[model samples]
Target: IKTPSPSYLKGTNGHAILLLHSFTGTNRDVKHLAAELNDQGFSCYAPNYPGHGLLLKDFMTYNVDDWWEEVEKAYQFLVNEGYESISATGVSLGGLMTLKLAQHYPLKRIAVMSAPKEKSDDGLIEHLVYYSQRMSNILNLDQQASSAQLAAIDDYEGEITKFQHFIDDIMTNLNVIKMPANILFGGKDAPSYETSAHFIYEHLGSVDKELNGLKDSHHLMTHGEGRDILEENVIRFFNALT
Candidate 1:
């Protein structure tokens, strides 16, 4: 399916960075992060995953592999534009993708923000609640309702299963990432993510990995109260890459 167009910001330095958003999220989710990095003289690209940046129902149409492909395309776009010093940062699902890229590409640096290494048991309940709400909205018999139910019913479980598979794959391959990495987690976020962040820090092949727990933030740290802290650490991480 055709997805929303990607966004880019040119910067002064020769370095280029790819910013990935969370699942079910749009490029706008990382706009602040991109702007901060751009001000530091790094060009940035934020691409909306396929089936994202649209109505919530559209999120059910794509799987994790599809999203991975979209990220690869964005990376190639940067490479084609002649960026030799490339780095990447991602939040949540985007963080997972950033790690995957680190494994496949020669990234200068990587920052993983709130990426979960395992599926949360509560995710099933969240999905059920989301679907039920969509169902109720569709029960009203209006065009919006009809469209919502059809989208929800068509690919809800399909998407979830694919995501589970993606998580599994990442868990198996964390040891392959050898580049310098900075992994951050929100102390108040889900316990699973905190566990995963530690796990990733321990498992990553990067001898130079740093793991941080931001006590004042939640899952969306890039856009929340922890943004300044997040940006500071990220800028420092990238600056120290040389």
Candidate 2:
């Protein structure tokens, strides 16, 4: 399916949920999960990072901090809507943002899928490069003679460094996160995810945190084999708090 722009659904449950998408992804990343959440009566909002919903050149101009700026925009947007109760959930990069929100925002609880706990190497230049190419592929999936994917990452090294800093930054604040949380990792995903999941679980100050492992799935849990249980866990986690 073609990617989608940001989406919102009014729900009957009276609580709100902000569904964050993955790195190099648009709100389309959370489409299925947002639909399921809304169907279950949770008001849902999914917003794209600064350039994700647009062209890749625009995407290359933005970095991790720029993405975080969008996160806060989405959060404050929901807050301005007057939700007395709200929580959040995300996958991959979105999951990392979810954890970041829990640290500084007033979110009541959170559930994150496949968020990395630390850098696996000296720098994530290659990782960012990979995601850029991945985005290029997604954009041209139907047909493409070409698009400029390589030219966009000129200062991406700086962006990667900032990303590394954010990863390190979150570590210092994990102990202050007292909200309820459900941390999940797909068993078939890289083993680093498992390590990070456990690391986040261990560092979280939330006594009510739960760790979930979906043995058959990969990194993109929302779109992959384990979505059924993934959705169920998210719903249960959000509902448990209210």
Candidate 2: which stretches are off by over 4 Å?
1-4, 53-56, 120-123, 131-148
Q: Per-residue lDDT tens digits of candidate 1, residues 1-242? A: 34568889998888999999986567888998898888888899999988764345555556677899999999999999999999999999899999989989999889999998877545743744464465446454466655554456545676676778878888798888998899999988988889999999999999888999998878987887877987898888887744
| Winning model by TM-score | 2
Q: Estimate each model's TM-score.
A: 0.88, 0.89
Q: Model 2: C-alpha RMSD to truth?
A: 2.9
lDDT of 2 by residue, 64-138 (tens): 888899889988888898888878999988988998998878788899899997774443555555765665576
Residue 174 local lDDT, model 1: 86
- Candidate 1: list runs displaced more than 4 Å: 1-3, 120-154
Residue 124 accuracy (lDDT) in model 1: 48
